[PDB]
Amino acid sequence: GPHMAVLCGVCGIKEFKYKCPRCLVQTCSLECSKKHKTRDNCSGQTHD
Numbered sequence: 001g002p003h004m005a006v007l008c009g010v011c012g013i014k015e016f017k018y019k020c021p022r023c024l025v026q027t028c029s030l031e032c033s034k035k036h037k038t039r040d041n042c043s044g045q046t047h048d
């Protein structure tokens with residue numbers, strides 16, 4: 001690949017696969033998606 005990839009906004013050690021509708025954080029997995037929720041107060045429903 002041409003190395004045109006974005007890193008996980010949370011852990012940033014491989015790549016992203018998700019993108020929180022609120023935080024817009026491109027997470028690598030649901031684990032990183034649920035990671036910001038417990039500290040940033042997020043549910044991930046866009047208008048939660």
Ligand SMILES: [Zn+2]
Pocket residue numbers: 008009010011012013027028029032
């Ligand atoms: Zn991650």
Ligand SMILES: [Zn+2]
Pocket residue numbers: 020021022023024036037042043044
């Ligand atoms: Zn979020």
